[PDB]
């Protein structure tokens, strides 16, 4: 008869088979993750292959049902989810090439190594070796070596793979009736809500631009304060007016400024909150931590953890010979099975992480009543926003004093609040321009606004003008610096981290308003409050059955993403930062570089292609060799790779500077290079058939 | 009533329930649902979510395609969990439910037929097994349900 | 009174206090080797440090006693051994620098890695990775990559360390009243025998030169046959007249030609002798193998293995969780304790190795009656010569037929004898010019005949003219190709392998003459021969109590090293090789190279130092880039490292050739390079301020 | 002759003997050396110098330690004792004299713990036997009983 009845029958059959296949795949994945060995990986492989084949077959079946006839919103949403992703239109060779490219990028990222200049047998991987250097070291040159070895021994490998990956993904997304792969990623946050204003995919770009323009002053003041603070530890490397070098930000990409906290802590004599000693006392174990988290979630009115949760979950590291992955994850296995897999140590970080994963589990149990396609967060940021807002409400000193974990003799002054707010801002506010800029760069790359010959130029342009971060070494088009991040090389969307913070602080302000909190927003606890828990459960129960705008308007009263709660959270810190940035300069200019003062401008006066660039770099290296031999009696083997070209106009002019071999931090002074050019001017001028008037060498 | 009915090792499915021609029931305390709405005893191994489907005046897959309760009161509804007998680590797919009928049933109509119904462009079986895993939630664990009538 | 009595008292005290702590160091080393743990390392290090301190202190005491006033031969030999080695005269900083240099060279050799051109994450160590390629691969380009990656990523690291090591060792040996470190190494084979002709240190050099000139024709014929057989595999890569490329010789350094046997085997349809199937049948184990070896050694008249040998020695890999080093070694622990440590498998190689190590043990129990200083071989080659001659006598097919490991239906024809003799010659005759040339190079480097600026030039010159082996890639003074060998980087003498081969066949011919063998020398078995065993025990009983020349004259009747028995061993193979090499060319010329045909001679007519060489290589690379861009429409990033300079006269002339980036085997044809020079001639002649007449570019 | 002499738990060193003022000996077959040429002397000399007990040779034990006259009227007994006088880590409770200023006459003893001069430094004239269980027959402890009539 009518096609919506056929769609209902097809959806019922698909749910009946999918709730079984995905449960079996989840059981196999859990068996592998809690017990790492062979004959366990291939079980996941066959379960996932069966689930993927079934999913693409049912998507091809669901493409038959039209959407414009169907008026019921639930079946329309399920059919939209089914039809949006299915079998790609790519050919078998194109699909195989795309899979090979993705696997190659993942393998290069995971197994790439950087070797020290001296001792070539000491090569460090990313995760145990280079991450420790970028997180802990306060040496400019070691950090520069770790930062420049990455993106050159790894990113240069990823540049052609990413160049082919962009084309293949753009073709695949164009086969899904989208403009590009960025639009396909922005197919989330897309609603067909009633009354007319549905959320479009370009509305997300407009909204994130507006949110960034609203958060620019607070980030500018935080940037100025951080610059003034680490001008003390790097005295002759930081410009008081310019941007910050990219390798002095606490990690290799500058994603989080959390590791900069010991460098930039105000009132260092005040101890931070750490109840780890009070939990190695009083006999706190993993079960005590998770029972305290369950008590906190009971206090707001959310249901208890299931009896199967306490049995089947891996709440601690197994003592027997069963290797596991030590990453905290909340598992929605299906058919009412909710488990948490984490190696809980007795630490405050694991306490907050347990609360975060219990928030994930509570979201899963809340939307478990929905049909299978709608059993997810409202968008990709909502789940982590809920986890982070429960972790935010738990970590207050009032909550720890109420639990008896913190001693009641502790006194919360204004100095400790500023320290807590600054430690929050280095992780929350410092990550927002980086996330926004990276997603903007990827969107313009997929759209085609950035040509393939301008990738690194555009990337290090918006890094200066948006993040206020300058590269320490010039990078031409042989580099791929975005691909040095995990989410770019492993094909992951990044805007969910941007929207997570906005939704998290919106939820925090709403729930603190409901729970009758009267003080500052950062000292708010929603414990033993049934109204806040009731409205939170109302938000969490509707998984994907309605638009995320409608759910957001239900919980916070606004249909749009608002960063006003985020600025109200950091308002005392904003006032203190404005007070501290009085003798300093707020803002940055995009002209200064670490290599900018020692660079020599070369003006081309007359076919100067890349081979002529190579010949020029070789002639400059020869001139440096001759100058250091005939002046300082030193034998230094300068190469063409030690001459760095920046600000390259295609045929007009460029700038060059020379670094020492085996020390990319050791930039040769401009007077030395000028004397080298003056001494060996004849060979350099003759090798290009021109006089000293053509090549100015200012 | 009798111990043979309640303690049966093999128990029939939802669609093909077999009928047979009190202080222990009150004080057993293992019955999750105790709402009393010749002695005939019926056989349901429905899911825990679908226990509320055995009640008058409602809709659902069991309520409108499997066994149906009329709009008057006749007997007693008993239900208890069975995760130890007919639930396994690898699953217990030995119970079936009817996913679709051409028309809604009469208040006590029963059919054990095995016909294929139309979904999309293919013919698929109208009898789908139950996924009864031991490590599952309360709404998906097997619930042993017996209704009675005189 | 007389200094003889005080010397006797001092020697008695020294041996009494040396046997103790020598047994303790041996026991600690055995406990580490049979049970590897970090706890067992410390006891070894403590015992070794105590023994070393005691030894250097007693050597300082022994320097007081003069050798000119003692007439007893035994006391004089013990005092000379004590006085020759002791505390070095090097300063504390110099000794620390030498120890650090030796440790650095060992660490670079053990931990050096070579990465493939594609896939930079695939890097191979020498021992499991590169050795397999050099031993098994029949690909020219993969072998060239493995050979060129070694000595470039490892040897270039070892070049300055070896340069400092030579100076430090020369100073240390000059402090021991020797001319150089080569003379200090040649302090072995030095006798003070009666009647006047004592063996001197220069006599060893004269004798090894004479022995090499005597073995030159057989090695020339073997080289011609191997070249003719490796002209079938590797076509258009081997000159029928010139030398052999260094990377096609069966291993990395061309030390042994054993792995070339499948390519050079005559009569390939004839199966070789292998009784491994007959020992996995009949229930043979490690104990059966060692009991058979003991029966063989008893059959000639040598004593039984001791009860402690069966009790304490590790004759098989331990079943329990004890890590061991799987290297066959015979241990003389001291105080009558003789053990063999090897992971015996049921193979013919382990059978011959068991006989070899039991010959070592028999030597140890034979000289165990001597005082502690004289408990060694007569020289450094005698021990391995005895082990290898027992292995020679036990490997005959007649012995295996008598034992029952070989079926009597097997028939020994002339074809199988030629196969056995060729397989012997690839390990015995093929290693002699390499060993002789390497020791000659090290002796001339230590003496100072080869200056530091001519190390690689001289090394490849005597490789071409002595071994008949040409390098596939030119190597300047930045390389250190000898240091890529284990014995050079780990400070080990190499002439003992040369003298072992001579003494081996001298002993074999003597013992086969005594045992009344009448057939060919390679089919001789000394089993059931009490006279041969009696004379062998007479040779082995005197450890170092007399001169090695006297012991050699006692066993073989000649006072000098003679290679005539070695040539008599290989006489049927020599006749067969002369019959095979009629249509081939016997000998080599030292002018042909793999890169010689495609090289362009450049004549300098007029300050052309290394910087001008770098500028020339860069200009040539730019010309190649321009030619491949403007002619074949290909973008190939030629660098200065892809231009190889050979036959470099210091200011007169040189030759150059271009290889492709990322394929050192891909040499650009000479016509293409000539067209590249002709197209971009203006920039090339302009970069050095000259015309095209001075740089001929023939 | 008596079982207490042969089965004594502790035998003293070679330099310090313990004298005391036959079908079992013939048929015991545990004695490695049973050569004859009531005072019973006891030593724990090593295996290779069991032959040093016999009269008419030189060495270390022959002169500086226990010394046998040219004419003898007694028996010499010796047996391997690795199970009692040897240990895994070494048993250094037995000592031997290494040097005397003058050669010994037959049958005298000295207990003096004097030092003596070798090289440039002074050291004791008593050196302890290194008796290990994992040693050869020549380097194994041998309990020696010599009768004199
Ligand atoms: C083989 O190497 C091992 C390594 O362990 C050596 O074994 C150690 O040997 C020493 C030998 O001195 C031994 O020390 C003896 O231990 C006992 C106490 O622990 C005592 O029996 C004895 O004390 C004597 O020496 C002291 C130092 O000289 C004197 O002060 C003291 O009076 C004792 O009497 C002797 O010395 C005086 C000197 O005035 C003299 O008048 C006496 O007559 C008498 O001679 C020692 O200290 C260790 O115990 C041994 N270690 C173990 C673990 O057993 C072994 O000696 C080495 N063998 C050789 C040949 O070098
Ligand atoms: C979740 O996903 C898993 C995937 O592994 C499914 O596992 C399946 O389990 C079912 C149930 O065990 C298996 O289905 C089989 O189908 C047949 C049904 O009857 C057919 O034949 C009759 C004629 O008599 C027709 O009328 C009818 O229409 C059907 O065509 C039977 O062959 C099977 O029953 C027999 O199973 C075995 C095999 O002989 C016997 O031991 C039994 O006694 C019994 O007689 C059976 O029901 C199916 O094969 C399994 N697949 C796999 C890949 O293992 C889960 O069921 C699934 N769950 C859900 C809810 O979808
Ligand atoms: C952890 O993994 C191992 C190996 O993957 C499991 O061993 C298997 O156990 C099953 C149990 O039914 C056996 O059928 C298999 O034969 C076993 N495989 C092997 C290779 O021995 C082990 O059981 C797992 N441990 C847990 C606690 O689940
Ligand atoms: C507010 O919630 C908290 C837990 O977050 C409760 O705090 C403690 O509860 C126990 C158990 O009843 C009491 O014994 C303690 O005195 C409480 N500590 C406090 C209030 O600091 C608390 O009970 C909840 N509030 C109310 C009013 O019940
Ligand atoms: C590499 O070069 C840097 C920069 O020249 C060296 O680091 C220090 O640089 C400062 C000036 O910025 C000098 O005052 C110091 O003398 C330099 N050295 C040290 C040890 O602090 C650096 O040493 C060079 N070498 C390495 C291996 O990094
Ligand atoms: C192998 O080595 C280990 C570690 O060195 C030995 O373990 C030691 O055994 C001794 C026996 O006396 C103990 O005193 C130590 O405490 C042990 N050390 C440790 C760290 O466990 C082990 O016995 C060795 N095995 C054999 C067979 O010799
Ligand atoms: C020569 O040595 C061989 C072993 O290498 C002896 O061969 C066997 O020895 C046993 C033991 O005497 C005899 O029973 C067998 O008959 C021998 N085998 C063969 C095939 O002859 C051989 O006996 C030794 N020769 C002499 C004379 O004793
Ligand atoms: C590297 O270059 C060599 C030499 O050009 C290539 O190997 C073969 O060379 C022969 C001539 O010697 C050609 O006929 C073949 O076409 C070449 N290729 C193959 C696959 O046999 C070699 O392929 C080049 N590349 C690599 C990765 O080694
Ligand atoms: C949660 O658990 C507590 C403690 O077991 C119990 O008293 C309470 O009733 C439970 N809450 C719910 C809603 O079941
Ligand atoms: C949890 O484990 C306990 C103890 O083994 C058991 O009694 C209980 O039934 C289990 N619950 C499950 C598996 O749901
Ligand atoms: C060697 O040992 C064997 C086996 O125990 C024995 O028969 C033979 O007599 C011994 N030979 C000697 C010379 O001790
Ligand atoms: C030889 O080994 C046996 C068996 O372990 C042992 O009883 C005996 O004491 C050992 N004999 C020696 C070491 O002389």
């Amino acid at each position: 008869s009518t096609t919506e009845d056929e769609a209902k029958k097809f959806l019922n059959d698909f749910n009946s088979e999918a709730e079984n296949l995905t449960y079996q795949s989840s059981l196999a994945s859990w068996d592998y993750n809690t017990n790492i060995s062979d004959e366990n990986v291939q079980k996941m492989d066959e379960a996932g292959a069966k689930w993927s084949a079934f999913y693409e077959e049912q998507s091809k079946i669901a493409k038959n049902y039209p959407l414009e006839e169907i008026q019921t919103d639930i079946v329309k949403r399920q059919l939209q989810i089914l039809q949006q992703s299915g079998s790609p239109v790519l050919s078998e060779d194109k699909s195989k090439r795309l899979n090979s490219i993705l696997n190659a990028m993942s393998t290069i990222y995971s197994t790439g190594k950087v070797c020290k200049p001296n001792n070539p047998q000491e090569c460090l991987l990313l995760e145990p070796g280079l991450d420790n250097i970028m997180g802990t070291s306060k040496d400019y040159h070691e950090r520069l070596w770790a930062w420049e070895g990455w993106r050159a021994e790894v990113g240069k490998q990823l540049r052609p793979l990413y160049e082919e990956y962009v084309v293949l993904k753009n073709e695949m997304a164009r086969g899904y009736h989208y403009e590009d792969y960025g639009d396909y990623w922005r197919r989330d946050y897309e609603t067909e809500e009633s009354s007319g204003p549905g959320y479009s995919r370009d509305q997300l770009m407009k909204d994130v631009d507006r949110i960034f323009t609203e958060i620019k002053p607070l980030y500018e003041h935080l940037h100025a304060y951080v610059r003034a603070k680490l001008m003390d530890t790097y005295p002759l490397h930081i410009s008081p007016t310019g941007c910050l070098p990219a390798h002095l930000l606490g990690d290799m990409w500058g994603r989080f400024w959390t590791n900069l906290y010991p460098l930039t802590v105000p009132f260092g004599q005040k101890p931070n909150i750490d109840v780890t000693d009070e939990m190695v006392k009083q006999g706190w174990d993993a079960n005590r931590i998770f029972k305290e988290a369950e008590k906190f979630f009971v206090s707001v009115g959310l249901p208890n953890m299931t009896e199967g949760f306490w049995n089947n979950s891996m709440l601690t590291e197994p003592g027997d010979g069963r290797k596991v992955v030590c990453h905290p994850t909340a598992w929605d296995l299906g058919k009412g099975d909710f488990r948490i897999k984490m190696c809980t140590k007795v630490t405050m970080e694991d306490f907050l992480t347990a609360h975060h994963e219990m928030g994930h589990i509570q979201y899963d149990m809340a939307y478990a009543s929905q049909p299978y396609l709608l059993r997810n967060g409202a968008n990709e940021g909502f789940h982590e926003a809920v986890g982070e807002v429960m972790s935010l409400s738990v970590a207050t000193p009032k909550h720890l004093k109420t639990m008896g974990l913190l001693s009641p003799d502790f006194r919360e002054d204004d100095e400790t609040e500023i320290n807590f707010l600054l430690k929050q801002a280095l992780n929350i506010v410092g990550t927002l321009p980086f996330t926004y800029m990276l997603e903007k760069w990827r969107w313009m790359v997929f759209k085609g606004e950035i040509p393939k010959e301008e990738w690194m130029k555009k990337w290090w342009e918006m890094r200066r003008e948006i993040v206020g971060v300058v590269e320490p070494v010039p990078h031409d088009e042989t580099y791929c610096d975005p691909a040095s991040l995990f989410h770019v090389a492993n094909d992951y969307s990044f805007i969910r981290y941007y929207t997570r913070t906005i939704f998290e602080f919106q939820f925090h302000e709403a729930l603190c308003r409901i729970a009758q909190h009267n003080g500052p927003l950062h000292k708010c606890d929603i414990s033993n409050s049934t109204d806040a828990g009731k409205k939170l459960h109302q938000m969490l129960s509707v998984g994907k059955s309605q638009a995320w705008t409608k759910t957001l308007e239900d919980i916070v009263g606004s249909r749009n993403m608002d960063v006003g709660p985020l600025l109200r959270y950091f308002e005392p810190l904003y006032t203190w930062l404005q007070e501290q940035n009085r003798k300093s300069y707020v803002g940055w200019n995009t002209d200064w570089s670490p290599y900018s003062d020692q660079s020599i401008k070369v003006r081309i006066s007359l076919e100067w292609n890349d081979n002529e660039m190579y010949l020029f770099r070789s002639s400059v290296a020869y001139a440096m060799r001759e100058y250091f031999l005939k002046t300082k009696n030193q034998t230094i083997l300068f190469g063409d790779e030690n001459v760095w070209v920046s600000n390259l106009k295609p045929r007009i002019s460029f700038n060059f500077h020379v670094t020492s071999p085996e020390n990319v931090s050791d930039i040769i002074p401009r007077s030395e290079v000028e004397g080298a050019i003056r001494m060996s001017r004849s060979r350099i001028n003759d090798a290009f058939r021109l006089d000293d008037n053509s090549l100015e060498f200012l | 009533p009798f111990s043979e009915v309640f303690n049966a090792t093999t128990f029939a499915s939802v669609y093909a329930w077999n009928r047979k021609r009190y202080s222990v029931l009150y004080n057993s305390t293992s019955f999750s649902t105790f709402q009393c709405y010749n002695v005939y005893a019926d056989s349901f191994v429905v899911r825990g979510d679908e226990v509320r489907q055995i009640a008058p005046g409602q809709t659902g897959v069991i309520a409108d395609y499997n066994y149906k309760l009329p709009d008057d009161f006749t007997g007693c509804v008993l239900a208890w969990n069975s995760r130890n007998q007919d639930a396994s680590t690898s699953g217990n797919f030995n119970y079936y439910y009817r996913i679709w009928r051409s028309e809604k049933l009469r208040p006590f109509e029963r059919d054990i037929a095995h016909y294929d119904y139309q979904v999309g462009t293919q013919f698929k079986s109208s009898l789908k097994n139950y996924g009864f895993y031991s490590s599952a939630g309360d709404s998906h664990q097997p619930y042993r349900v017996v209704v009675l009538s005189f």
Side-chain angles (χ1 to χ4, degrees), chain A residues 6 9-10 12-13 16-17 19-20 23-24 27 57-58 61 64-65 307 312 335-337 339 375, chain B residues 47 83 89 93 97 99-100 117-120 122 124-125 128 130-133 135-137 139-140:
Chain A
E6 280 325 285
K9 298 201 311 188
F10 154 75
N12 290 1
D13 221 290
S16 78
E17 299 277 353
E19 286 181 29
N20 180 55
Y23 190 35
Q24 295 182 168
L27 283 170
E57 158 205 326
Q58 297 295 289
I61 293 176
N64 309 337
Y65 296 93
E307 175 214 308
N312 307 122
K335 316 208 94 170
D337 198 7
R339 309 179 196 190
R375 288 193 204 135
Chain B
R47 256 177 29 181
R83 32 166 290 102
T89 312
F93 317 100
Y97 63 99
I99 202 170
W100 171 110
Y117 80 127
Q118 185 40 244
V119 158
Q122 40 183 10
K124 219 190 289 273
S125 154
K128 332 215 80 206
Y130 262 124
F132 280 151
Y133 286 79
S135 148
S139 49
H140 291 79

Side-chain angles (χ1 to χ4, degrees), chain A residues 621 624-626 628-629 632 634-639 660-661 668:
Chain A
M624 296 302 306
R625 282 172 179 231
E626 207 78 12
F628 271 72
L629 190 58
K632 318 177 139 48
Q634 298 182 239
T635 301
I636 308 190
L637 298 191
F638 286 99
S660 270
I668 309 299

Side-chain angles (χ1 to χ4, degrees), chain A residues 385-442:
Chain A
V386 165
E388 289 270 10
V389 71
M390 311 282 90
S391 159
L392 248 201
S393 197
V394 156
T396 45
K398 165 70 65 72
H399 187 254
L400 303 174
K401 217 174 305 285
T402 287
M403 268 193 337
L405 203 47
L406 192 69
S407 68
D409 42 69
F410 181 76
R411 195 44 50 245
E412 310 143 57
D413 40 5
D414 286 6
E415 312 229 314
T416 40
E417 294 175 2
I418 291 303
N419 291 27
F420 169 70
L421 280 180
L422 182 103
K423 220 203 182 321
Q424 286 287 96
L426 292 181
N427 180 74
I428 282 146
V429 190
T431 199
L432 286 181
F434 175 77
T435 299
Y436 162 71
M437 183 288 297
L438 187 126
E439 261 311 295
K440 214 196 185 193
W441 181 89
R442 273 212 290 201

Side-chain angles (χ1 to χ4, degrees), chain A residues 571-588:
Chain A
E571 192 65 38
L573 176 83
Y574 186 47
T575 294
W576 182 84
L577 281 184
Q578 284 183 286
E579 193 42 63
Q580 290 303 304
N581 294 333
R582 199 55 59 84
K583 295 321 127 185
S584 152
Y585 176 77
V586 181
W588 56 86

